[PDB]
């Protein structure tokens, strides 16, 4: 597991597309919607299996003659020449959560809080924000609890970090302006119920110069393919979720001028490209031969 | 690359990817301000003035067609717009023109007709109108018939020309 120098690009990792696919199949077997409506319209009505998915971990291990490499440097931005490299038989256990604006029950960056983009400066691109210290989210339907206390300290690390990428600047947490309900709010899967939180409410903070109102919904859009999937209704009165947060998906406005003379950048949550969730766990891993 | 859309109407700008495959794509206006873009399957609206009445067609994306539709078009909406896919910049210029009659309805003889053309900030405007009659009067910036006629009732058509494209407004007439 000797020192060698190679470039890893998480943004072009060939496996995530595979891993993203493997997740789609895991889903076909586990949560089968009663109804899929797709574009004529191709549609089938079936009696549902009603089997919840309770996040079984998956290993994509390197096939025959192909090696999975890991990157050594302690903090690595998404695209970089990596100074030190090890080799591993298998990717580690991966818990696959299909999530938005939040990354769930995941992996934590150890010393520094790291922001990875195919381009960070890119005015357009999804931003991962891999985190050093984690937080707890518990929900009941009803309401969701995020500690009031955790946010002011976390305000600090971010106020400390962003400026360093974007110096002499002022920072906004603002709710998402438009788009679909899954993007608008935090989409996630707990126990065969799909959840949205108007977290528009949560980022209401601006910088330097707390309970979420979740909805339980049985008809939902699919991340998987374009369209709507319908899942049958709930047998029990009350449901428990404990989740831990390891991360974020983010975008900020830019706007490139117009005597706004704005000091500001506004970052709004984000998500919906499933492959990015898959990317935050898998960015270190790479598949090669010889 | 220029197309023209009538005021109050619905217009669509076209975007093409290299292979009939879904690609993350996103949309921008003359300032690098975001209208509409997508995440995989899901859709989102940019913080531009436009966001609502900014919407694109979903069905298309597997082919790799990622259109921008502005509907309930406004004059101020005319802009040069740029769609980004697989690191390509494709651009289209959109201008909005509107025609209007002097007043709402029921105009009778000796009375006079004025059509006015509102053109977006900074553009050339010339007008051709064929009367229901077909006598053709070329107003240019506004068209006036000083005194009105029997011949004149019914629906007649004006043409506005920019970037060598013509757009039709037809005005229904009661005399």
């Amino acid at each position, epitope marked *: 597991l000797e020192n060698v120098i190679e470039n890893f690009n998480m943004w072009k990792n060939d496996m995530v597309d595979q891993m993203h696919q493997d997740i789609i199949s895991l889903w076909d077997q586990s949560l089968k919607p009663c*109804v899929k*409506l797709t574009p004529n*319209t191709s*549609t089938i*009505a079936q009696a549902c299996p009603k089997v919840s998915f309770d996040p079984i971990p998956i290993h994509y291990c390197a096939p025959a003659g192909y090696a999975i490499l890991k990157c050594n440097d302690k903090t690595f931005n998404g695209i970089g020449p990596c100074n030190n490299v090890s080799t591993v038989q298998c990717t580690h256990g991966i818990k696959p959560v299909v999530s938005t604006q939040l990354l769930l029950n995941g992996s934590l960056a150890e010393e520094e809080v790291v922001i990875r983009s195919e381009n960070i400066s890119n005015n357009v691109k999804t931003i991962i924000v891999h985190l050093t210290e984690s937080v707890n989210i518990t929900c009941i339907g009803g309401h969701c609890n995020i500690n009031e206390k955790a946010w002011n300290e976390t305000l600090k690390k971010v106020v400390e970090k962003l400026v360093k990428y974007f110096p002499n600047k002022t920072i906004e947490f603002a709710p998402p302006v438009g788009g679909d309900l899954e993007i608008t709010t935090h989409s996630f899967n707990c126990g065969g119920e799909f959840f949205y939180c108007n977290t528009t409410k949560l980022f209401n903070s601006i910088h330097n110069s707390i309970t979420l109102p979740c909805r339980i919904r049985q008809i939902i859009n699919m991340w998987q393919e374009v369209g709507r999937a319908m899942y049958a209704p709930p047998s029990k009165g009350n449901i428990t979720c404990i989740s831990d947060i390891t991360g974020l998906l983010l975008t900020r406005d830019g706007g490139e001028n117009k005597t706004e003379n704005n000091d500001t950048e506004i970052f709004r949550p984000g998500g919906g490209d499933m492959k990015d969730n898959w990317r935050s766990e898998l960015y270190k891993y790479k598949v090669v031969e010889i | 690359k220029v197309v023209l859309g009538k005021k109050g109407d619905t217009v669509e700008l076209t975007c093409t990817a290299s292979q009939k495959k879904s690609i993350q794509f996103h949309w921008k206006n003359s300032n690098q301000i975001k209208i509409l873009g997508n995440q995989g399957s899901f859709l989102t609206k940019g913080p531009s003035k436009l966001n*609502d*009445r900014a919407d694109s067609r979903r069905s298309l994306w597997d082919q790799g067609n990622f259109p921008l539709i502005i509907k309930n078009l406004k004059i101020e909406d005319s802009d040069t717009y740029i769609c980004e896919v697989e690191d390509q910049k494709e651009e289209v210029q959109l201008l909005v023109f509107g025609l209007t009659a002097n007043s709402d309805t029921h105009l009778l003889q000796g009375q006079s007709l004025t059509l006015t053309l509102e053109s977006p900030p900074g553009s050339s405007p010339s007008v051709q109108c064929r009367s229901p009659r077909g006598k053709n009067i070329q107003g240019g910036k506004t068209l006036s018939v000083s005194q009105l006629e029997l011949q004149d009732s019914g629906t007649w058509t004006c043409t506005v020309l920019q970037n060598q494209k013509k757009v039709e407004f037809k005005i229904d007439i009661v005399v």
Partner: antibody
Amino acid sequence: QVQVVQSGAEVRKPGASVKVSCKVSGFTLTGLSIHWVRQAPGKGLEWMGGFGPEENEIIYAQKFQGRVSMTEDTSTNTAYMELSSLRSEDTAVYYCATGGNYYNLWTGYYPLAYWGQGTLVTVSS
Amino acid sequence: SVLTQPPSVSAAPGQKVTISCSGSSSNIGKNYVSWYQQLPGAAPKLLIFDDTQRPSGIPDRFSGSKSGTSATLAITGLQTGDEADYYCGTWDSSLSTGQLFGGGTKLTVLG
């Protein structure tokens, strides 16, 4: 053929729920398919509810919010509507509406393509 | 939160006639307009959907248009048979409100 059938006309005492069936022949109801609309005698169309761009809801207009429940069973291929806590004004003709033979991924967008015969409810002292 | 159309309209048996409904960018500018024909004491039928699209079995006499924040229904060769009441439907984005109907108009042809 395509068909819509509504259940027989019915009479109610103020304060009692009413439940009205719909059966659809010629397609399998998507479950996003159906909107319930009723007409007062002598009056124009009033829309009670149906599915909307908010996913969890098949959504009901405000006048009807405390009291009304709408259903489609994708399997029996019929839809049921209950309006409860009845009023003098509620007598009207309740109509079952469906979209079809249209692409409704948009789902937000279908037209009300097939209409039922209409079914009548009158509420009285 | 409400559409308006006229309460009444009339015409000769040869003659063309139109019914116009107007709303707000909150309902109509944003969304599609479809039209419903209601015959004497019968369930309402979809005369028109998606602004200009006529469904099967409607004759070509019927037409539709949309522009600005109002939409227009057009009729030609009007028939004794065409007597009925017409309603304009638009799905609406703002507030809760959902699907909305204008009051509608009763059209009469003079026989």
